[PDB]
Amino acid sequence: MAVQISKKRKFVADGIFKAELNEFLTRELAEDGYSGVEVRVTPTRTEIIILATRTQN
């Protein structure tokens, strides 16, 4: 990457990414039955599965 961040900051940034993700979806999907997230970071694609109860909602 052109910015060339270190792995020390990169894993910390991924942790803060997961934390802000979990907090935002906890605030937003609270009435719909939120239960968690699971993010698979592949090259050029980012799969990010909401794990929730009421899928229709």
Binding site: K8, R9, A13, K18
Partner: protein
Amino acid sequence: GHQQLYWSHPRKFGQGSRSCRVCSNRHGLIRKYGLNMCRQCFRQYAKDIGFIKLD
């Protein structure tokens, strides 16, 4: 004018320039490894980040 006095104080340094990324307060900031967040919210979200009290 007001545009030349509203935000003309230099904010290039100090603990008043940086803040938490949760509380946006200016005390007890963890700037180490680019956390840039207070120690209370660090204790709150250390399990979500990956920090764990092994020893």
